[PDB]
Amino acid sequence: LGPRTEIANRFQSFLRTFVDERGAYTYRDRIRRMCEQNMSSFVVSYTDLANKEHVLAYFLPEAPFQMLEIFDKVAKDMVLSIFPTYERVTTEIHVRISLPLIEELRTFRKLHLNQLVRTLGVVTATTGVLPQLSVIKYDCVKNMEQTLYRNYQKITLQESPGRIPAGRIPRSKDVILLADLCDQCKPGDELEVTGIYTNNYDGSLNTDQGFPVFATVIIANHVVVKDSKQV
């Protein structure tokens, strides 16, 4: 896609050229800060993003995931180009967003699928933290070993018991987290999330009973803790 040409330029012209707030922009330093803490969660703020170029809100939603590819390739190509020193260890990347507009539960519907989202929740019971599979390999005769992994934990959120619509039922939704954004969920807290809406890969697609069994699922690019009860 020849379009893919210009986007990374608009990143590459943006992560190591921009200055805001009277110099030494974070992007010069956050990466290395991340690199010094081995973190892989370098953050963007959409407000600064629109301060430079708000065009990244309107070619995004035809597939924001390819946008995130077009983010991570740039980041990678900055780190190991500038920290080829880094070229040993983990050597993979993704970024974060914090469109800092609060929007609410019980509104995502027919027209909120797989698109630019921003939502909260409140946390309750879920499972441990466990792994998955990642890659396309299994064959040689004419594989279930040496096949890279990625951790996993299930969520469960809940909604504000303060801003309730007066005897409307407290509700519930099934949502996901992933390896790097994991081991921070616990019962009884809230967490503000970038958020993104879809369904299962295939949630029971067939002639069936008098109603399909369909679910709806979300994950976070960014999570920013709202509670933070220590320093």
């Binding site: 519907r109 027919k110 909604e159 018991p161 309730i164 007066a166 005897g167 067939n206 002639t207 008098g210």
Partner: protein, 588 residues
């Protein structure tokens, strides 16, 4: 095609809705004008229309409804295209109304495809649970574009072929993303109470509804549904509908005048005579229960229970509150349940029900353990359906030692969480309550403490701030007012006291007072210290357990009575009369 009959009914449909409909102009374009935001697709049209111009060709419409409704949905789109800058992305939602026509017993096989009108209640409900209804695919080979209708319950991913003879079990996975799908919900609903048979029960029936109809339903209301009964392709039965018809524009005693809003309280011009002339209170003591007689203190006191309380502007550190805990006792054979029953007619969310029957699980839901919908739906209940409402109950007497777990929450916590195998959240009690215990042999024999005259639990008589009992006496001239009133109780001519304040003008004026929010820098409000002090001079004798939780009554009753003047800026006099009957409360 036979159904071109209904397409001509759909021609018929267009013919009047695009043409002159009513008012010298259009009826059905402001709907159309509004739908453009998400391509909203929801539009209501009168069924009388099929009488105004179709000339009672409803029987050319009203039978083939699920048969031809699709075509009516096609007509909606064909309307929109004729003038709106349009591509055929427009979908379906048609929500007919105006059917002078109204039940569960009038149901058969035969009732398919109609538009009858029915009303029910809100219970036992399920949430948003969408359906990616449309979608694309093909057989093993090549033809990867199908904008078809895969939505009929008989739908399947693998198909046979489009251009060439292909496999018959293979499938592609395809465009479920640049396309149009739906959303819906599902519940159970029970037979109305305007309709009530002998023997039989308001049996349960189950239904779905559309996006604009969705999550716009609350506790016990009277709406007009659509009679599109439909099959289960399992069978068993179901049904369906598309139209509902459940205070800026004014209540009864009006015609249009001006206010803070359009006609929210506009009719001051007629209210105000009945607002300030403080003997109007006597109408509210006399012209409201003319068919009834008892003490005259209840009939001068309940009103502020019905009416809003404090609702001030103060802290986040702690809540302040308006309503009050309440009771009434005596012994039976004294007409002590007429009134509660009447409230169900008088006032909204006057849910007169027994307490004798209820469980501790009366209030919320308890359990699910199979995939009903999601294996954990324990957020159904009985109380918080008080939509700005109260739950007064009978037979608080033999009740268990668990209900207090909720009543402990009454005026401080008002929050709702459960120690079950589900989750915990909370909710807002909007509600007050009534007390309905009774004594053993009745008489509260005046030799032992009134606490000990029943001797019930520990904190109950801390929280309930007024009890307002009527106890029995034997002086039969008392009794000879009664039957000589019931001289006109059956004798059908003016068989009560002459009134002076209709129910509907009463009920309207209730609101005018609830949007004034008084402001209290009252020097007499500073001399409540002397009021409460001379009170405690009277408390000093007759030596109950008294504190500032009762001061809360000292505050609210008079301040909310200044509301009851439809007034800001509290007036000291309300305190003294408030003092008076409340000076009985220790002597009570």
């Amino acid at each position: 095609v036979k159904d071109e009959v209904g397409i001509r009914a759909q021609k018929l449909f267009q013919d009047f809705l695009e043409e002159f409909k009513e008012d010298g102009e259009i009826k059905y374009t402001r709907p159309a004008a509004s739908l453009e935001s998400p391509d909203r697709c929801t539009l209501e049209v009168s069924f009388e229309d099929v009488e105004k111009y179709d000339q009672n060709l409803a029987t050319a419409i009203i039978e083939e409804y699920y048969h031809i409704y699709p075509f009516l949905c096609q007509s909606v789109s064909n309307y929109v295209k004729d003038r709106i800058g349009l591509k055929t992305q427009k979908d379906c939602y048609v929500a007919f109304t105006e059917v002078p026509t109204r039940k569960v017993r009038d149901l058969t096989t035969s009732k398919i495809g109609t538009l009858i009108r029915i009303s029910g209640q809100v219970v036992r409900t399920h949430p948003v649970h969408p359906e990616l209804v449309s979608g694309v695919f093909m057989c093993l080979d090549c033809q990867t574009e199908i904008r078809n209708v895969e939505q009929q319950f008989k739908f399947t991913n693998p198909t046979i072929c489009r251009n060439p003879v292909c496999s018959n079990r293979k499938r592609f996975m395809l465009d479920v993303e640049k396309s149009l799908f739906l959303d819906f919900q599902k519940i159970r609903i029970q037979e109305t109470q305007a309709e009530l048979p002998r023997g039989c029960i308001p049996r349960a029936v189950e239904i779905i509804l559309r996006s604009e109809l969705v999550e716009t339903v609350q506790a016990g209301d009277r709406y007009d549904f659509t009679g599109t009964l439909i099959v289960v392709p399992d069978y068993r039965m179901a049904f369906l509908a598309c139209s509902v018809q459940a205070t800026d524009l004014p209540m009864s005693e009006v015609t249009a005048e001006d206010m803070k809003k359009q006609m929210t309280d506009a009719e001051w011009h007629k209210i105000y005579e009945m607002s300030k002339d403080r003997n109007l209170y006597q109408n509210l003591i006399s012209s409201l229960f003319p068919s009834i007689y008892g003490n005259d203190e209840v009939k001068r006191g309940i009103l502020l229970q019905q009416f809003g309380g404090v609702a001030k502007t103060t802290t986040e550190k702690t809540s302040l509150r308006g309503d009050i805990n309440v009771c009434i006792v005596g012994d039976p054979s004294t007409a002590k349940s007429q009134f509660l029953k009447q409230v169900s007619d008088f006032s909204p969310r006057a849910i007169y029900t027994s307490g004798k029957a209820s469980s501790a699980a009366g209030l919320t839901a308890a359990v699910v353990r199979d995939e009903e919908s999601f294996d954990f739906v324990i957020e159904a209940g009985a109380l918080m359906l008080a939509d700005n409402g109260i739950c007064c109950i009978d037979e608080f007497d033999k009740m268990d030692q668990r209900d207090q777990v909720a009543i402990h929450e009454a005026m401080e916590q008002q929050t709702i969480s459960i120690a079950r195998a589900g989750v915990r959240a909370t909710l807002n009690a909007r509600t007050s309550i009534l007390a309905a215990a009774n004594p053993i042999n009745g008489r509260y024999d005046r030799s032992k403490s009134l606490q000990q005259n029943i001797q019930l639990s520990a904190p109950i008589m801390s929280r309930f701030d007024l009890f307002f009992i009527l106890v029995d006496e034997c002086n039969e001239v008392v009794d000879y007012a009664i039957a000589r009133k019931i001289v006109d109780l059956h004798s059908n001519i003016e068989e009560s006291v002459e009134r002076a304040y209709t129910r509907e003008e009463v009920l309207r004026y209730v609101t005018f007072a609830r949007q004034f929010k008084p402001v209290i820098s009252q020097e007499a409000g500073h001399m409540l210290v002397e009021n409460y002090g001379h009170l405690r001079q009277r408390d000093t004798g007759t030596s109950w357990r008294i504190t500032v939780r009762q001061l809360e009554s000292m505050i609210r009753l008079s301040e909310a009575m200044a509301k009851l003047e439809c007034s800001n800026r509290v007036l000291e006099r309300h305190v003294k009369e408030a003092f008076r009957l409340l000076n009985k409360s220790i002597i009570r």
